[PDB]
Design a protein around this ligand. Structure first.
Ligand SMILES: [Mg+2]
Ligand SMILES: [Mg+2]
Length: 382
């Protein structure tokens, strides 16, 4: 945990992806992205994921801040994008996909060799998903609404999976670990010039905008869900009786315990007392709890149309934002990419080196846009 040891961790977790510039006439509004992570906890609790939709034009990128363990953050890391993917899929594909089980490409991951996929849950997670697309097949797509549904579906699927557990003892223990741990989620969906950010928690998305003079401007694409968010404090007090205004949030924490006011997992703040107690009798592993449903995983979605002036997007957990002001981040990234960080290797690594040179896991994804392509898209609007 000395500078050297930290350096070695950075190189070891460093990831970089460049979009296939190929002249066959390609559309990527993304030049590529960089990502890195610094652990502060034994198994780090933060996760990072990135993927291109094989059936849909877009690309999915996200960061996940776990707590009370890595179980939930690991799970949502590898499951959420599939629920989002399926959720954006048209009826015919859903069809040929179901009618395909009784197998086709949905997503293509861009994963560091270090990150992984759950071992024994591929069957379970798969069926969970199947059931979801079957429901969609039961019944024009709005990306914002697809994100909210995809998010809420996975959280609800995690809850009942914990309730039915699978006989294998390991599998049963895993669905519980996942459901009793928690995780933040800040996802960006990029389809051409359309940028959607779905946020759940205190991780955050920031757009790097370069002014006509060359100076850098940061524009927030997500609101952190915590005590520092008065609209979130008003929403919490409103979701419960008036007598509870004095206890929903006690110290700046939800019910006096949780910092993030939205998250996946953490079912200790969602389930009824009896549901909790009963489930608890299987597998040897809150204050003013009056009107039980207190935490949601439902994201806040914001839309942004990319323009030539928008150079990059940085997704990161609060591990980053607790060390630097929002504009310094953008300034630092902007100059690095602009090659002026020396005036007077990997963008994610560079930034984390600034954030550190710490008291929480730090994960960052820096996405760089192709201003020529983005400009191209714009010229065929206007
Ligand atoms: Mg965490
Ligand atoms: Mg954190």
């Amino acid at each position: 945990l000395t500078p050297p040891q930290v350096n070695s961790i950075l190189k070891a977790n460093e990831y970089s992806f460049k979009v296939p510039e190929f002249d066959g006439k390609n559309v990527s509004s993304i030049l590529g992205f960089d990502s890195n992570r610094l652990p502060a906890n034994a198994p780090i609790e933060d996760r990072r994921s990135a993927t291109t939709c094989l059936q849909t034009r877009g690309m999915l990128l996200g960061v996940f801040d776990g707590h009370a363990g890595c179980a939930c953050s690991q799970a949502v890391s590898e499951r959420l994008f599939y629920y989002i993917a399926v959720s954006l899929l048209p009826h015919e594909t859903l069809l040929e996909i179901e009618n395909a089980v009784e197998l086709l490409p949905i997503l293509q991951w861009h994963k560091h060799p270090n990150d992984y996929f759950s071992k024994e849950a591929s069957k379970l997670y798969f069926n969970g998903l199947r059931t979801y697309w079957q429901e969609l097949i039961d019944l024009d797509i709005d990306v914002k609404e697809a994100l909210i549904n995809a998010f809420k579906r996975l959280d609800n699927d995690i809850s009942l999976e914990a309730q039915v557990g699978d006989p294998n003892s390991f599998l049963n223990y895993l669905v519980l670990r996942v459901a009793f741990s928690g995780a933040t989620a800040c996802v960006a969906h990029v389809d051409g010039v359309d940028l959607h950010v779905a946020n759940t928690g205190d991780s955050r998305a920031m757009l790097g905008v370069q002014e006509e003079d060359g100076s850098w401007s940061a524009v927030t694409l997500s609101n952190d869900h915590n005590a520092q968010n008065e609209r979130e404090l008003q929403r919490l007090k409103l979701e419960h009786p008036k007598n509870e205004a004095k206890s929903v949030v006690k110290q700046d924490r939800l019910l006096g315990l949780l910092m993030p006011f939205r998250a996946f997992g953490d079912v200790k703040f969602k389930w009824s007392i009896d549901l909790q107690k009963r489930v608890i009798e299987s597998g040897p592993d809150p204050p003013n709890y009056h009107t039980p449903p207190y935490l949601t995983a439902e994201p806040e979605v914001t839309y942004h149309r990319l323009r030539p002036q928008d150079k990059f997007l940085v997704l990161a957990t609060d591990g980053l934002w607790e060390t630097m002001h929002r504009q310094d981040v953008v300034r630092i990234v902007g100059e690095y990419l602009t090659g002026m960080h020396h005036q007077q290797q990997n963008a994610a690594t560079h930034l984390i080196r600034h954030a550190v040179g710490y008291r929480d896991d730090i994960t960052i994804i820096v996405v760089q846009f192709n201003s020529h392509v983005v400009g191209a898209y714009q010229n065929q609007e206007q």
